[PDB]
Amino acid sequence: ADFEVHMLNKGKDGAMVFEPASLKVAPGDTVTFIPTDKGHNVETIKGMIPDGAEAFKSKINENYKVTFTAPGVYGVKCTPHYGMGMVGVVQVGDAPANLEAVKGAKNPKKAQERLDAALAALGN
Ligand SMILES: [Cu+2]
Numbered sequence: 001a002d003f004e005v006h007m008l009n010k011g012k013d014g015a016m017v018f019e020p021a022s023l024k025v026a027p028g029d030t031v032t033f034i035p036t037d038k039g040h041n042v043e044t045i046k047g048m049i050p051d052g053a054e055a056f057k058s059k060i061n062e063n064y065k066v067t068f069t070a071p072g073v074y075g076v077k078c079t080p081h082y083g084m085g086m087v088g089v090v091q092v093g094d095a096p097a098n099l100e101a102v103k104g105a106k107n108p109k110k111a112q113e114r115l116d117a118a119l120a121a122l123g124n
Helices: 099-104 109-121
Strands: 002-011 014-019 022-025 030-035 064-067 072-077 087-092
Touching: 002 022, 022 109, 072 099, 072 109, 087 109, 099 109
Parallel strands: 002 030, 022 087
Antiparallel strands: 002 014, 030 064, 072 087
């Protein structure tokens, strides 16, 4: 299955957001991250990807398609706007084994506030 996530300067949840900020997909599904506004990218957050997965980092302004392989929870950020809280979470499959490890990862305050909300929206 294929999904879309947009990067915007302003959304319902405030400035510098991924929409949706929380998404559950199946193993093998693809998500395209699309900078609707210019100046954004997507990168995995350190400490917030499952075992067996490889980190990724897109270029500024490109539409970046990723096929998620290893099951678990992935935290993503926009590189320039991580400190402003521009983050999101993608859960791949049921019963993510690294859910408890990702809740403990360290992030700047505004990002953590939004990651905690996004993790709670997954019923986590
Ligand atoms: Cu950004």
